Amino acid sequence: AKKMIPIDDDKLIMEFKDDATAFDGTKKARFKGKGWLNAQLSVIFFKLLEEHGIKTHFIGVAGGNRLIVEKLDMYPLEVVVRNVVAGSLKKRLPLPEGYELPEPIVELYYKNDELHDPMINYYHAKVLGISLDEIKKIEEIALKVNEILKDYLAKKGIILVDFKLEFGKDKNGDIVLADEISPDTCRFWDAKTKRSLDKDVFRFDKGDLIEAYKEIYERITGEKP
Amino acid sequence: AKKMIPIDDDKLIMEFKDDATAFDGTKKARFKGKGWLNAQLSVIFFKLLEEHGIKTHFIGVAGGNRLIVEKLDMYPLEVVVRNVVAGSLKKRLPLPEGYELPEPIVELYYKNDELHDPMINYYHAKVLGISLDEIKKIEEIALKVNEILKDYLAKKGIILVDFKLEFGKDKNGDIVLADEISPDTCRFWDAKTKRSLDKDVFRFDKGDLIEAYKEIYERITGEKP
Ligand SMILES: Nc1ncnc2c1ncn2[C@@H]1O[C@H](COP(=O)(O)OP(=O)(O)O)[C@@H](O)[C@H]1O
Ligand SMILES: Nc1ncnc2c1ncn2[C@@H]1O[C@H](COP(=O)(O)OP(=O)(O)O)[C@@H](O)[C@H]1O
Ligand SMILES: Cc1cn([C@H]2C[C@H](O)[C@@H](COP(=O)(O)O)O2)c(=O)[nH]c1=O
Ligand SMILES: Cc1cn([C@H]2C[C@H](O)[C@@H](COP(=O)(O)O)O2)c(=O)[nH]c1=O
Ligand SMILES: N[C@@H](CC(=O)O)C(=O)O
Ligand SMILES: N[C@@H](CC(=O)O)C(=O)O
């Protein structure tokens, strides 16, 4: 769903593609316009977060589906924040889809193809070279990101169910939010109907992906795509 | 592999059976004498730990395969401490069987049949009603148990590879070590040959289980069963 093109030493191009995959890449389709939607929405979220004092890798836009971002030394993690029970969480807790959590859950996943991104804890992370201090800073940022995104979306009648973040280290050794934030990497439910406005539409054939992504875009920006 | 028989309000009987199961109970066999070996070895480990200031549920012995233990409000957890890469850890870290960890790993598993004992972290635990303070005390005890067992066994030419503990709360709200500690719930390797003296012998047909358990017993006690 994304291509990364180096520029110099400091920055690279992050290009969003129309490709979609699910179930460990076993399900595939292409959706015209998805790259554009995901690019734009990432820009809006990064800008929101930056205003709130979150260090992100966003530098600028390079026309269309491409963003200019800061090159980072990436942590091999997917950091998942969860507010409402959905997806894989139903296999860890005996709780129904839609259950409102008493407080957010943060999950760590090790980004590894050989192993299919297994869940890990702080101890595995330490073995992978990530200190407890670093994990703690990462979860602190993720939880702050959760607060900002969920408040901002709740005002627009969207429940932030759960979402995935990734992080890297900059040249000062600061922890910087990286990758993307889009309906590919979040669960968004309509506050009223509880219906998915995200990649779950493609994952489980809940309707047309592009329509759902357009709706999200419109409900956030007030403008048509 | 064990039966629990209530006595009064304060205590129950923990009886060790000759039954063995593996792979989520799908593989089954019976080994004459296993109950006795596991009972005795649990007694030896609990006594060792008690001398070292670990609060356990051990009260006494009730002849043969039965122990008298303190009734506790059990945490729904299996707490796994790991020193050497083996078993399921090979699916979380790209490291070979026998890799020596730079420091111990503690893993939490939610004791739940519906869900087949999934791994969890501190956040899931909080949702299950287990405070961060409690998790922290539990991991502190487990790591202390690790130190004592590994030192004690290393002197006898046995590597403590990994092991599983369980815990409950007593009437004072103290966290007490519970269940069993036996070759069913630990990995024990000969320091020289690196060969299994534990349930892995049954799990993977590495030889005769009873012989392996007898050997452990003999190497710990200096006496024949
Ligand atoms: N600022 C950055 N600097 C360096 N690498 C990044 C940055 N942001 C994202 N990446 C990495 O680029 C890759 C993006 O490709 P892709 O596999 O499509 O995304 P992901 O796997 O993260 O969903 C990922 O490995 C991601 O960690
Ligand atoms: N001191 C104790 N008080 C109350 N329950 C206990 C105590 N020690 C162990 N138990 C519980 O008794 C059960 C033992 O049965 P079994 O299923 O054979 O063992 P386990 O499932 O723990 O391997 C477990 O649910 C265990 O948590
Ligand atoms: C598995 C996976 C989930 N996610 C996101 C989608 C969901 O919003 C959230 C939790 O997903 P899960 O329910 O599959 O664990 O993380 C990704 O962005 N990439 C992935 O590869
Ligand atoms: C799965 C499981 C493991 N264990 C023990 C055996 C191993 O010593 C240790 C780690 O096992 P694992 O490698 O299967 O995760 O925990 C149990 O006692 N009971 C169990 O049900
Ligand atoms: N459906 C997942 C892939 C997976 O389950 O591995 C996704 O978000 O792409
Ligand atoms: N083999 C495991 C069972 C499992 O894998 O679920 C055991 O220790 O009994």
UniProtKB/Swiss-Prot annotation, chains A, B:
The keyword Coiled coil does not apply. The keyword ATP-binding applies. It catalyses: 5-amino-1-(5-phospho-D-ribosyl)imidazole-4-carboxylate + L-aspartate + ATP = (2S)-2-[5-amino-1-(5-phospho-beta-D-ribosyl)imidazole-4-carboxamido]succinate + ADP + phosphate + 2 H(+). One of its GO terms (molecular function) is ATP binding. Keywords: ATP-binding, Ligase, Nucleotide-binding, Purine biosynthesis. Pathway: Purine metabolism; IMP biosynthesis via de novo pathway; 5-amino-1-(5-phospho-D-ribosyl)imidazole-4-carboxamide from 5-amino-1-(5-phospho-D-ribosyl)imidazole-4-carboxylate: step 1/2. It is an enzyme of class 6 (ligase). GO terms for biological process: 'de novo' IMP biosynthetic process; cobalamin biosynthetic process. CDD domains: SAICAR_synt_PurC (cd01415). It holds the Pfam family SAICAR_synt. Its EC number is 6.3.2.6. Belongs to the SAICAR synthetase family. This is Phosphoribosylaminoimidazole-succinocarboxamide synthase. The lineage of its organism: Archaea, Methanobacteriati, Methanobacteriota, Thermococci, Thermococcales.
